[PDB]
Amino acid sequence: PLNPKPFLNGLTGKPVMVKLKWGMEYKGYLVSVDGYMNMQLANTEEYIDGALSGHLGEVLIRCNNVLYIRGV
Template sequence: MSDPQETSDPSTFLSEIIGAPITVKLNSGVEYKGELSSVDGYMNIALEKTVEYVGGQVRNRYGDVFIRGNNVLYISQDVM
């Protein structure tokens, strides 16, 4: 895996961590934590084994989630 500081394109970094646990925070403040399944050029994200957090509290658990890229505030890789 390359050094994230050397990566100039976020989609390249995300494609390198497919299968890793990530956190996606939406513009609305809702957070989703799950395994990154796929990402496309528009930063649309598919997650597996997803947990939804609202106000820091678990709201729902989902198998698969698709998040449109224009709703994303940030994406971070979770350290295990």
């Protein structure tokens, strides 16, 4: 068993890839996830269509946009 809040608490600091619901991808080190799962990522490259497209760096992603977040 590994619930999403322990998974995200063990996921902090690691380079994670958040795919939004709308095709947007974000590769960055996960800094902080609250209980409402607003995610905060650092050194984030925004990847669209699997292609490195922008360097946004520090970023806050609101919760209701996240399709999934995975490790990479």
